[PDB]
Each structure stands twice: as structure tokens, then as C-alpha cells.
Amino acid sequence: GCCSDPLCAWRC
Numbered sequence: 001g002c003c004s005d006p007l008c009a010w011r012c
Contacts (some may be wrong), residue, residue, distance in 0.1 A: 002012030 002008035
């Protein structure tokens, strides 16, 4: 899920 890539990680 998005909490991996810092481009999405702020709020998966």
C-alpha cells in the first residue's frame, strides 16, 4: 500500500 512510496506515503 501507499505508505511505501514517499510520493503517497503521508496518508495511505
